A paper describes a structure:
Sulfatinib is a multi-target drug that selectively targets FGFR, collection stimulating factor 1 receptor (CSF-1R), and vascular endothelial growth factor receptor (VEGFR).
The pyrimidine nitrogen and the adjacent phenylamine NH of sulfatinib make a bidentate hydrogen-bonding interaction with Ala564 at the hinge region of FGFR1, whereas the indole group fills the hydrophobic pocket and forms a hydrogen bond with Glu531. Consistent with the previous reports, sulfatinib demonstrated potent inhibition of FGFR1 and CSF-1R, with IC50 values of 34 and 5 nM, respectively. Unfortunately, sulfatinib cannot overcome any FGFR gatekeeper mutation with IC50 values all over 2 μM for FGFR1V561M, FGFR2V564I/F and FGFR3V555M. These structural models predict that the bulkier side chains of isoleucine, methionine and phenylalanine residues may clash with sulfatinib and prevent the extension of sulfatinib into the hydrophobic pocket, thereby leading to the observed loss in potency.
Numbering used by the authors: 460 to 765
Write the structure that this text describes.
Amino acid sequence: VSEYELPEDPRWELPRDRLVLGKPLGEGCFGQVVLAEAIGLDKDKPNRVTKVAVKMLKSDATEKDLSDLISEMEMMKMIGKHKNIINLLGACTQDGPLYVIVEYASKGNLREYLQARRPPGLEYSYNPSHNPEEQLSSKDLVSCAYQVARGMEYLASKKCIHRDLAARNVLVTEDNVMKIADFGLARDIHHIDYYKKTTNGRLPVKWMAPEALFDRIYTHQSDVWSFGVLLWEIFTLGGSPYPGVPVEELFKLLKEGHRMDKPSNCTNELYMMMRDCWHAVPSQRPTFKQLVEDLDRIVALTSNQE
Ligand SMILES: Cc1cc2cc(Oc3ccnc(Nc4cccc(CS(=O)(=O)NCCN(C)C)c4)n3)ccc2[nH]1
């Protein structure tokens, strides 16, 4: 029995013997995510199995870690469901460690998904996958961007600021639906280390708007700046931002007006949309509502023949 009072919500609680735990999906310093099969997740369909992702704490986990995971779960309930975010499906709070059960995205994060779909040749770096998949169409790429914009428009409408929107935090389902992840994470109460890599080797400083970098100010406008970086990641098919640029240099550069150059395969229109997201002045960036409307139009005009 836990020493803590884990919050049981009858609408969401699943007996944990309805979960058949499967392979690890990922592990961080937080805990771990595993794939599972859930039996009768939908009450009206008790005999059906659903593949799901299950988040749980490491054994080394503290009380703040627990509080953080509960917090993510409750924030997700409050934000509600949208097609282009990772949605809550249930929880196990009784009879063992806390499990938070969410939609499963079988194709993993967007950066690695795009990298494995890199065609040969001059416009992209090499494909690092030993199981490369069919390359995407131009329309497919704009449609990835559109779906992420639509998810952020929803989150913004629910007053959620993501604060680390990046291709690594977009997951892709079996049906190639884009789903924003890690939007419900607690904001650390301590100052951050700008030079500390994630468990997957990423430096989050490269997605920060200048006002976030400089003064730790995060708003929907600073998420639009990150979406501009994410756009650049899409049209480089998973490229790494500011190539050759040491991180301790980045703010100076940005402040002087430095911006990433256009990816080799990227329309003038989509590069101008990136640059607009990277407006120095937060009030002058487009909103996610505007981004969605423009990307909708651009998707309809973009060829899926190549
Ligand atoms: C409460 C909560 C639960 C939760 C679960 C999350 O993870 C989820 C949720 C839904 N689906 C997937 N699918 C998935 C499939 C393959 C691999 C991965 C992990 S990965 O880091 O993107 N790539 C694996 C190895 N790379 C580093 C080489 C995830 N994960 C992510 C955030 C979450 N927040």
